[PDB]
Amino acid sequence: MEKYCELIRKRYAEIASGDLGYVPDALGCVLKVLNEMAADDALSEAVREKAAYAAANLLVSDYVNELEHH
Amino acid sequence: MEKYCELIRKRYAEIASGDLGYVPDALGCVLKVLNEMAADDALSEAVREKAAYAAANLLVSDYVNELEHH
Structure with missing residues (x-):
């Protein structure tokens, strides 16, 4: 978490706390x-x-079925 | 794949073909x-x-161990 900029750390805390949706x-x-x-x-x-x-790299990876995710 | 813009489709094809790295x-x-x-x-x-x-949403999700990824 430490490597991320302030804005990402702030918004992470807000999703986790329910100040933002998930x-x-x-x-x-x-x-x-x-x-x-x-x-x-x-x-x-x-x-x-x-x-x-x-x-593109994520789609070609096996983390996503790039044809049918959505 | 069809919902992505032309640039993403082009770069996807290039990673897949070896014109770009993965x-x-x-x-x-x-x-x-x-x-x-x-x-x-x-x-x-x-x-x-x-x-x-x-x-932030990806980090808080269970797709990543946000403390220990990388």
């Missing part, structure tokens, strides 16, 4: 956000690429 | 990128928050 489909949640960023022309190409690669 | 720690890879974005003052606060929330 999304049980946690892999789906990360894929949704990474997909939005990858597609966001308002973001730099470097940022879009970083998001895209992490998403 | 990162076996796929959950670590998504957490690293989300953490970089969450901390990036060059990105809008809305974008930072979307990245932070998805990362």
